[PDB]
Amino acid sequence: EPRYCICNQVSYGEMVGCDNQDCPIEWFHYGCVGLTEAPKGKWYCPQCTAAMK
């Protein structure tokens, strides 16, 4: 029921959480952010990565 990610679709498949506390979206599908495997440490989504540089 809740929609997640930049794509605004329900949770499906492998999901990753952005570790920036102010991330507006928080939860993303792996594919929508270019991942194939679980991050081995903290992970920041592309939008938060752009905001942190």
> Shortest CA distance to 15 belongs to which of 35, 41, 42, 1?
35
Longest distance between any two alpha carbons in the chain, whole Å: 34
Residue 25 among known ligand-binding residues: no
Residue 18 interacts with which of Zn ion, Ca ion, none, CB < 5 to 8 Å by class: Zn ion
Residue 29 in contact with Zn ion, rule: CB under 5 A: yes
Which one of residues 1, 3, 39, 48 is an interface residue with Zn ion (CB under 5 A)? Answer: 48
The burial class, CB within 10 Å (0-12 / 13-18 / 19+), for 26 is middle
Residue in the shown chain whose Cβ atom is closest to Ca ion: 8
Q: Report the binding-site residues for Zn(2+).
A: 5, 7, 18, 23, 29, 32, 45, 48
